[PDB]
Structure formats: C-alpha cells, structure tokens
Design a protein around this nucleic acid. Structure first.
Length: 341
RNA sequence: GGUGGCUGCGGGAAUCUCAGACACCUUAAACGCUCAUGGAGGCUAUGGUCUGCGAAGUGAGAAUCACGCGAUCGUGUGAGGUUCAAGAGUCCCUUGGCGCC
DNA sequence: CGGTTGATCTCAG
DNA sequence: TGGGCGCCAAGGGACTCATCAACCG
C-alpha cells in the first residue's frame, strides 16, 4: 500500500568499496558537468537543456572517448544524478513567481562526506535475501540488519556516511496494515526544551524527559572538532579526525532518531488522535539563545515521524495552526479535538 | 582482589560478552592505544595542568570468534547474545561547533 | 539466459 | 571585538518514491 525504505548496512570488500566510491564520484561529476552545461546552454541559447536533452548528451558523453571511463559505473547512478539535477531545477521553478519562500538556485557540490547514488530495478536487478544484497554492478554485498521485506523493490540508494561506513536504503511498495483500535481516543503533546514531550489526554500526563544529546556530548564534540582544526587539510590523520567527528555526530543523530522513533510509535500505538502544534523550528533557530536547544530537540523530525507513521498505521495527526507545559498540552489536545470534532 | 569508563567488532540505541590500553582504591568521576618522525607547545578556568622522561602536528598499525590457504602471523569465507523501535531520497535554506582575523 | 543501457515526461529564470 | 570567512555536522521544508525493449557476454 505504502512506500517504505528499509535501511540496511553494507559490508562491501575492497573491490566493491572502490566501485561504490567510483560510482559516487562519477555521479557527482555528471551532476556538476550537466549543471555547468545547462547554465552555459541557457546563457548561450534562449532555453536551457531539459531532462531528455541532458540524458541524450550524457549518453553521448559516456559513449565518447572524452570521458569513456564513466561507462564503468552503474547507469542508474548517472541517470538519477541527472534526475536529481532536473528536480533541483523543478524545485527552483516551483515558486519563483510566488514570494512566500525563495528556493535557492541549484549550485555545484565539492566532495562532501555523505555521497549517495540511486539504482533502479529492472527485471530482477535487485535481490534481497537473508544476509546479502544484489546490486547491479557490485554483485552480492554482505548486509546486516536485513528487515522482513514483502514487496517489490523499487530502488536502492547506496550511501556513504564515514570513510568506511556504508548504508543502503532499499525502497519497496509494501503493504502496511492499519494497527488495531488504539487504547485511548485522543491526546495532545506539547514540546519543550526542559521536558522533551508532555503528552496528556486529560487523565494522565506521562511527561517525557528530554535527553538533550547534543548539549550532553558537547564537550567530546568540542574536543573532536578542536583536534580536527589543528590538522592540515588533505592529510590522512586529518581524515581520521574527520571520521571521528563524523561518527560522533552519527551517534548523536542515531540516539535522537531512536528516541523519536520510540516516542512517536508509542504515541501512535497508544492514541487514535495525536494533537500537536505546527511549530516552525527554522524560525526559532534565529534566536541564538535557544537555537542550540531547538536544533538538538528536533521538533520538525518528531512531528514528521508522528504524522507519517500516523498515515501508515491509520492514525490522524490534527496539527494545530500556528502549569505551563501541562496546560499547553491540554490546550493542544482540545484544539485537535475541535479540529477533528 | 573490588569499581568506573576510553577506543574497536557485534545493523541503531540501552545492555551484555570479547579484545587495545587504563584509572580510582570498596568510591565515583576523568582519559583510547602502539611504533616512526616533528621540535614548545595542547587543554582549561590573572591562573591550573601534560610536556626537552617529548607538545600540537605528520605516516602507518592492532583492537570479537570459528574454519579454509600462506611462512605466532598474513590472506578469504562464515558466525556474533539479549529487549525496544526502525521511511527514506532529492534539492534548497537555516544554525550548531571549531579555527583565524 | 542473466545482467546492462538508452530512451521515454508533463513549465521555467 | 563581535561580525566575517573557512571548515566540519545537524535540522527544516516541500515534493517524489520508474519501466521496457534492445544489446551484450
């Protein structure tokens, strides 16, 4: 019924790691090259290249001797790089006429650390099993964390998070059954820096303690960043410290995402209606006094997870249009009930 | 002999076992390590700390178990307990930290 | 036959 | 002497989430 991405962890060997690195590099190369080519074409001509023209020129590029060493890369990687470039342009053109928010012009990119390429599924090109994954030009890659999949595999996003930590997101149109009737009809949740969530239905208020990971591991993060900054760019030990900092950040985000997953799933399995307010953290983060706390708390991710898991599992999130915490939570529940009825 | 964690594998997290170093003495906090090189600095609240018994840096290396093949150690494959939960991609924008001015 | 590749599609600034 | 310029990460906010006939070893 629903799209769903099963994120597993790859353990590619030397050759497969080299090929994943080469594929990410060539995907970035074609992204930059065709952004430059489209800009040059729109400057020289009345209109720039569209998706089909870019694909045809990419084919001519691969078949040519100028960059024939890009043919040894998975085709869907380059094609979806071009698709991402074209959807960048589509996002830019979404609301140029509108003035509510300016979507920035698509720019270049210069060797970030998180490089992901997508590969599509054509007549059994992706095969998921007990402990392996089937990728087009890689072959069999030893995975772990392989969940239970009972749907058709749409695409596989091969990622890279550290110098030696590769994930892979396998998308499938799985059937997601609606959960049984919830124990309680409706409840409202109030966010907060001191207490992460105060959720109540009028009879109890199981306040959820705020972990505040980012401030909690702020000293080790500061030490990691400082050890990085004393190191020369383009150095092996610079790369080592960079990976250390990246993994510290990955641990922080992992803990935050696990906490948010557990809390959102608990709410959706406990209440039929989960009322909350449409807080805009990107506006509050301009206040440097509370910005670090709002960044760490991640209200936006919490609300996104609550809402989409409600959509999957047959729950309704009645977001409100834009003591203290307890009364705010009760008012949120009342407003959600009013909106629903 | 007791206790706490630092680093590494165990998909994430909490635990938990193992391993590369430790520290404190029944008490809870703090810190990953080995070798080569480099020459006065690194961290922190006017000062304390580690340091010519070597500082920032720079390069390499080890960091679970079984089995297969090499002359204990390299090379390949396989396994990794436990409870909870697991939807991502794209682009753009923003701010968090550090360093220098 | 199993795997890989090139063409499809519907806006602009 | 905090704003500015370099890097390294995160979150926030919309949308989007592919298929098939030919070619090749």
């Amino acid at each position: 019924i629903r799209n769903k991405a099963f994120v597993v962890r790859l353990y590619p060997n030397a050759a497969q790691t080299e090929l994943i690195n080469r594929t990410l590099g060539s995907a970035r190369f074609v992204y930059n090259h065709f952004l430059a080519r489209r800009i040059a074409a729109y400057k020289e001509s009345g209109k720039g290249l569209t998706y089909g023209q870019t694909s045809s020129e990419l084919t001519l590029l691969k078949q040519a001797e100028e960059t024939s060493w890009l043919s040894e890369v998975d085709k869907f990687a380059l094609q979806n790089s071009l698709k991402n470039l074209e959807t960048a342009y589509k996002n830019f053109f979404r609301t140029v006429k509108q003035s509510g928010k300016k979507v920035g012009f698509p720019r270049f990119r210069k060797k970030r650390t998180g490089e992901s390429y997508r590969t599509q599924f054509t007549n059994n090109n992706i095969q998921i099993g007990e402990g392996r994954l089937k990728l087009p030009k890689l072959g069999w890659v030893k995975t772990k964390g392989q969940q239970d999949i009972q749907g058709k595999i749409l695409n596989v996003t091969v990622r890279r998070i550290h110098e030696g930590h590769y994930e892979a997101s396998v998308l499938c149109e799985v059937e997601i059954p609606y959960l049984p009737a919830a124990p309680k009809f409706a409840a409202g949740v109030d966010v907060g820096i001191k207490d992460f969530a105060i959720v109540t239905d009028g009879v109890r208020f199981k306040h959820e303690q705020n972990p505040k990971y980012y401030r909690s591991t702020l000293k080790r993060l500061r030490k990691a960043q400082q050890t990085l900054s004393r190191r020369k760019k383009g150095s092996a030990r610079y790369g080592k410290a960079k990976t250390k900092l990246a993994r510290i950040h990955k641990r922080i985000v992992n803990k935050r995402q696990d906490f948010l997953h557990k809390l959102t799933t608990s709410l959706v399995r406990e209440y039929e209606i989960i009322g909350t307010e449409h807080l805009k953290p990107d506006n509050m983060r301009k206040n440097r006094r509370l910005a670090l706390s709002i960044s760490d708390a991640g209200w936006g991710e919490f609300i996104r997870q609550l809402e989409y898991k409600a959509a999957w599992y047959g729950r309704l999130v009645s977001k409100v249009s834009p003591d203290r915490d307890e009364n705010a939570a009760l008012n949120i529940r009342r407003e959600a009930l009013v909106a629903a009825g």
